[PDB]
């Protein structure tokens with residue numbers, strides 16, 4: 514998303530975002546189980 | 548962004564973003580003094 518620059522920063526951001534998303538998903542599957 | 552949840556994660560994202568932006572600004576200032 515910035516060519517080859519800011520690899521470690523882009524990784525960190527990516528990880529934190531994936532975790533917010535994953536945690537929200539878990540909350541939703543507690544809220545509305547199948 | 549998400550109320551009071553994910554305080555640490557949002558702080559992390561914000562910081563890394565501010566650092567990317569700072570480096571971009573530095574490069575641009577060197578490119579065009």
Ligand SMILES: CCCCCCCCCCCCOP(=O)([O-])OCC[N+](C)(C)C
Nearest residue numbers: 515517518519520521570571572574575
């Ligand atoms: C078009 C205007 C925007 C240009 C973006 C600024 C690019 C200049 C960044 C220069 C310093 C920050 O490099 P970085 O991310 O620590 O690199 C990681 C290691 N490499 C340098 C080998 C890739």
Ligand SMILES: CCCCCCCCCCCCOP(=O)([O-])OCC[N+](C)(C)C
Nearest residue numbers: 533536537538540541549551552553554
């Ligand atoms: C519809 C989508 C809603 C998603 C909301 C899911 C929230 C998930 C909560 C877990 C994520 C982290 O929060 P926490 O470390 O427990 O907060 C600690 C600080 N307070 C208690 C004051 C807030």
